[PDB]
């Protein structure tokens, strides 16, 4: 439902309603064109969202952050109108900035310069560990932090 992009990144197969969260996850919310469609039809998912960012090629690092809320997602890098790359999304090893630590006594919950940092402990059932205080968070806490 949105036109094709000359150069940039297309993030397809986002769960319905979650595009806004994807942009947050990426720190995008300036200069470059962005398109979103929300709640559009998806043959395999029922509904989906699509994000299109002109003139920016999301890295494998930036991209893996998406898997936290949109593990189904597919990342296409677009050049001259041709999709030149279709990234394999993986669970990121480390998450700096996006997730806060639920421990009110964690240094990351008190010092503005102390940026929250989580290291993935198991991908299987997804468990992440705060690198400062060792508090563990699950997929629930993760998704309820970013989605709401």
């Amino acid at each position: 439902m949105v036109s094709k992009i000359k150069n940039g990144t297309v993030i397809d197969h986002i769960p319905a309603g979650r595009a806004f969260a994807v942009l947050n996850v990426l720190g995008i919310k300036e200069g470059f064109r962005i398109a979103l469609v929300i709640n559009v039809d998806s043959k395999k998912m029922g509904k989906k969202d699509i994000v299109k960012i002109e003139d920016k090629e999301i890295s494998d690092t930036e991209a893996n952050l998406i898997t936290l809320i949109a593990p189904t997602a597919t990342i296409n890098i677009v050049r001259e109108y041709e999709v030149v790359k279709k990234t394999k999304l993986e669970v990121p090893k480390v998450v700096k900035g996006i997730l806060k630590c639920p421990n009110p006594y964690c240094i990351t919950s008190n010092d503005v310069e102390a940026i929250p940092t989580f290291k993935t402990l198991t991908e299987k059932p997804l468990k992440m560990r705060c690198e400062y205080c060792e508090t563990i968070i699950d997929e629930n806490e993760i998704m309820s932090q970013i989605l709401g």
């Binding site: 964690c106 240094i107 310069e113 060792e134």
Partner: protein
């Protein structure tokens, strides 16, 4: 090489054995100890006060020829504070109420940061003191049977002790606490030696080489009645002491309040006073590995 001392994990088995030897040397308090901190200033930044640990490090530093500056107590940033200490000093020993404070400090800092306690997280130099004491007594740490007694959930010393033990081969570590104060799953999953959670010490007291106690505090339980119903059985009593093996030892990182019956003091099994007396030489040792090698 040792630099920041933030976790018990910072130490290898090799570094610990080295530290034990240096501690032995510094214990036999010769008046010709090498002044490795001469012309150096260590700052003691105790955001959360503790006078016992403050004085221990200060004495360690004094013994090594260092100068001491510092503060105890009292909206500036931890980061900004750490940057300030870097102007003034050549190493920082900090204690803080926030978990991970030492780790973060050591990331901001060029000079070495030594964790003297960070929230309910760790107290790594205490663990060095604890195992030095044990190793002194038994000539080994490998193969010993341990029992941790009291609060095993919110005690940084317990945390640091459990983690430091993973450089060794304990036969078994008993975890004796009320249900509420059990070691965190997170921490237990790190461990590489047999552990066993139990609720009453008299069930296993006959097996332990090392009994290590921490205080349980009222302001933690569902209500004041539960505490009162549970507290009397995590006290080290004279009876519990008498049921220990002849060659066994009782440890506690001070201060104590009432969790050890004071009659225990007079038994040969009481080792907590000897434990505190190694505080200085052990910390001298750690400082020596950071600055003197």
């Amino acid at each position: 090489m040792l630099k920041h001392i933030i976790s018990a994990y910072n130490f290898s088995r090799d570094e610990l054995e080295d530290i034990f030897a240096l501690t032995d040397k510094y214990s036999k308090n010769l008046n010709d100890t090498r002044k490795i901190l001469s012309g150096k200033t260590i700052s003691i930044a105790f955001f959360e006060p503790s006078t016992r640990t403050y004085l221990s490090f200060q004495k360690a530093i004094i013994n090594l020829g260092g100068d001491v500056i510092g503060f105890s107590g009292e909206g500036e940033n931890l980061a900004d504070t750490i940057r300030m200490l870097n102007n003034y000093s050549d190493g920082i020993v900090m204690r803080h109420k926030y978990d991970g404070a030492s780790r973060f400090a050591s990331e901001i800092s060029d000079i070495p940061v030594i964790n003297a306690g960070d929230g309910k997280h760790e107290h790594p130099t205490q663990a060095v003191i604890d195992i030095y004491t044990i190793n002194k007594h038994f000539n080994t740490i490998d193969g010993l049977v341990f029992a941790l007694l009291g609060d095993l959930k919110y005690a940084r010393t317990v945390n640091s002790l459990l983690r430091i033990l993973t450089r060794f081969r304990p036969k078994l570590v008993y975890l004796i606490s009320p249900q509420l104060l059990r070691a965190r799953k997170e921490i237990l999953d790190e461990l590489n030696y047999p552990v066993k959670e139990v609720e009453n010490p008299f069930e296993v007291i006959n097996e332990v080489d090392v009994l290590y106690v921490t205080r349980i505090q009222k302001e933690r339980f569902v209500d004041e009645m539960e505490y009162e119903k549970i507290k009397g059985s995590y006290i080290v009593s004279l009876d519990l002491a008498n049921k220990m093996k002849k060659d066994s030892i009782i440890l506690h990182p001070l201060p104590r309040v009432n969790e050890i019956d004071r009659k225990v003091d007079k038994t040969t099994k009481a080792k907590y006073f000897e434990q505190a007396s190694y505080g200085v030489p052990v910390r001298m040792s750690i400082l020596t590995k950071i600055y003197g090698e």
